[PDB]
Amino acid sequence: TRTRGYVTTKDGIKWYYEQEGSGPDVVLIPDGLGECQMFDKPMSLIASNGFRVTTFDMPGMSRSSDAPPETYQDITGRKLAGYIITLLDTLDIKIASVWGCASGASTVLALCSDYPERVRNGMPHEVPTENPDILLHIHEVDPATISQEMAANSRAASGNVEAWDALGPEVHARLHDNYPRWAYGYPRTIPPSAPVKTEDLHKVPIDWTVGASTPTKLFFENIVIAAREGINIGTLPGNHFPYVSHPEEFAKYVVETSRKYLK
Amino acid sequence: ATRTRGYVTTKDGIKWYYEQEGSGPDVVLIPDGLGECQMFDKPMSLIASNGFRVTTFDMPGMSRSSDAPPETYQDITGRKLAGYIITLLDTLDIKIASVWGCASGASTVLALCSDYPERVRNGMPHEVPTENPDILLHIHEVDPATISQEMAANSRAASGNVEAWDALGPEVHARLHDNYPRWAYGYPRTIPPSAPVKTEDLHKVPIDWTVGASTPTKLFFENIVIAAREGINIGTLPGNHFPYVSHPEEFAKYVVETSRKYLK
Numbered sequence: 001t002r003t004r005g006y007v008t009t010k011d012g013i014k015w016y017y018e019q020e021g022s023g024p025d026v027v028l029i030p031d032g033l034g035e036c037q038m039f040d041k042p043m044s045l046i047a048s049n050g051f052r053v054t055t056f057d058m059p060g061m062s063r064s065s066d067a068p069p070e071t072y073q074d075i076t077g078r079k080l081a082g083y084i085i086t087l088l089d090t091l092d093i094k095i096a097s098v099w100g101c102a103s104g105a106s107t108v109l110a111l112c113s114d115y116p117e118r119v120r121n122g123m124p125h126e127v128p129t130e131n132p133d134i135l136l137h138i139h140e141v142d143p144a145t146i147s148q149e150m151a152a153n154s155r156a157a158s159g160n161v162e163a164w165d166a167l168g169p170e171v172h173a174r175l176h177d178n179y180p181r182w183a184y185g186y187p188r189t190i191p192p193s194a195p196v197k198t199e200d201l202h203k204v205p206i207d208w209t210v211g212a213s214t215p216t217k218l219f220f221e222n223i224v225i226a227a228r229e230g231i232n233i234g235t236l237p238g239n240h241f242p243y244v245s246h247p248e249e250f251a252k253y254v255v256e257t258s259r260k261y262l263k
Numbered sequence: 264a265t266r267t268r269g270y271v272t273t274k275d276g277i278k279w280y281y282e283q284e285g286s287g288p289d290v291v292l293i294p295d296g297l298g299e300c301q302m303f304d305k306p307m308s309l310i311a312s313n314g315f316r317v318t319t320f321d322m323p324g325m326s327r328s329s330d331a332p333p334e335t336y337q338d339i340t341g342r343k344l345a346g347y348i349i350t351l352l353d354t355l356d357i358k359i360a361s362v363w364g365c366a367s368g369a370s371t372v373l374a375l376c377s378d379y380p381e382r383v384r385n386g387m388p389h390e391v392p393t394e395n396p397d398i399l400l401h402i403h404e405v406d407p408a409t410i411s412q413e414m415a416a417n418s419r420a421a422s423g424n425v426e427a428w429d430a431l432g433p434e435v436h437a438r439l440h441d442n443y444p445r446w447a448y449g450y451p452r453t454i455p456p457s458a459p460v461k462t463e464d465l466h467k468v469p470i471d472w473t474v475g476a477s478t479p480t481k482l483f484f485e486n487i488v489i490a491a492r493e494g495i496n497i498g499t500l501p502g503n504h505f506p507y508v509s510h511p512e513e514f515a516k517y518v519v520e521t522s523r524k525y526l527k
């Protein structure tokens with residue numbers, strides 16, 4: 001059944017994490033906002049399909065806020081990957097199918113490139129390679145303004161505003177405090193560190209996705225890179241948060257995709 | 264410097280309405296499915312000012328080119344349109360050109376690239392239809408008024424700039440009003456499946472493929488994958504389905520720069 005709790009890793013991070021199911025491991029790395037409650041619904045669906053699912057709030061975000069300052073500053077896919085590996089080590093997860101969007105996606109690719117032995121298959125979604133216009137000066141305004149703007153930006157890219165809104169007051173309160181922290185340590189360093197070089201994409205199977213309703217330009221390069229490297233590339237319903245907008249379709253994708261690499 | 268406007272009847276019986284501007288290497292602007300060439304007015308001057316003779320026209324059966332046999336606007340495919348264009352190009356004495364086209368215009372560009380490579384200096388396809396959206400699944404079965412109502416809103420939504428779209432004028436929109444039904448009856452059902460996107464259709468001449476920057480990814484997702492896998496230059500243009508209307512300056516710059524690439 002679903003377990004919820006905390007675990008303090010040797011890097012000082014007091015992780016808030018959840019787990020459900022039995023069977024092969026599936027890890028759901030949240031996006032830049034680091035809020036794992038977004039995976040609640042799909043998590044049950046995936047878990048009921050013969051997989052042990054693990055999710056967690058990201059370092060310094062939401063319930064994983066009790067972490068060293070260093071763990072949420074100058075963030076890169078590889079930096080996050082290191083933290084993830086330490087967490088996986090402590091939870092005794094030897095190998096897993098890994099899902100990730102935005103910064104989570106960058107982490108997935110970092111895992112595939114630097115820790116291929118821990119990845120069964122990677123499922124990156126909308127890897128940031130160039131920050132959009134709206135995030136250029138996000139850190140230059142008051143924290144309250146950052147939360148206001150990012151709350152609007154996120155809701156707009158939710159893929160389903162009713163579902164987004166339906167995440168609940170608790171989640172949205174947590175997100176409120178996350179916005180400024182995310183702005184200060186993610187957007188400027190995440191994109192340039194994207195592990196999308198040829199050397200990063202062939203160690204383990206990868207199934208790449210982008211939002212079906214996401215404006216083409218946003219993650220256009222993701223599609224071209226995948227196609228050029230001969231990596232499976234397709235779309236998922238919604239935009240940036242397919243696990244919130246279309247939990248059923250998201251769960252199905254994670255299950256089928258992961259299931260095909262099992263042996 | 265001055266816009267040339269006229270009519271010409273080709274051997275196939277089509278009374279074409281066309282426009283031309285500038286002198287030098289030829290640039291042809293094939294309209295989209297709506298076949299309304301007034302959408303290229305602004306960029307037409309911009310491009311022509313850079314040393315190109317630009318030519319555009321209302322598509323057969325559409326707008327001012329409405330006096331055409333019914334077969335020229337029924338069961339339309341990229342190849343059918345290409346045949347007509349070639350005849351027109353012959354009539355206007357255009358030997359080779361840099362050709363632009365969106366939607367059905369894009370299918371036409373690819374057809375030209377595949378079947379009449381000798382007439383194309385470089386192809387610039389934009390949003391080639393390969394898989395119709397659900398909004399068009401049953402558009403050919405409803406009455407003209409409903410088609411016009413729906414397509415007018417549909418088109419405006421895909422304009423990429425509602426203000427510039429609206430600013431096309433009452434004349435244009437009145438012409439568009441009548442084109443909608445005709446388009447629906449002869450394009451959406453047959454254009455997509457006829458898309459000249461086979462491997463052997465894309466490598467006889469240089470091609471520079473584009474998709475709207477604001478267009479929902481899924482709409483022309485296949486265009487991007489095909490291009491990338493086939494090693495064809497692929498990118499985006501600001502706007503959606505009508506970059507020539509929404510962003511005339513950027514559109515003009517793209518056409519000029521890409522065409523320049525293939526000139527000696």
Ligand SMILES: C[C@H]1CCC[C@H](O)CCC/C=C/c2cc(O)cc(O)c2C(=O)O1
Nearest residue numbers: 031032033102103128153154157187190
């Ligand atoms: C915060 C989250 C979604 C915000 C909505 C935004 O509207 C999403 C726009 C796409 C980019 C998101 C992004 C860029 C970046 O450089 C680093 C990141 O961690 C993200 C990211 O995780 O996006």
Ligand SMILES: C[C@H]1CCC[C@H](O)CCC/C=C/c2cc(O)cc(O)c2C(=O)O1
Nearest residue numbers: 295296297366367392417418421451454
């Ligand atoms: C009519 C024009 C744009 C209409 C707005 C619509 O919102 C455009 C939707 C995307 C595809 C348009 C299209 C599909 C097709 O199978 C054949 C076509 O000739 C077109 C086309 O030319 O699109």
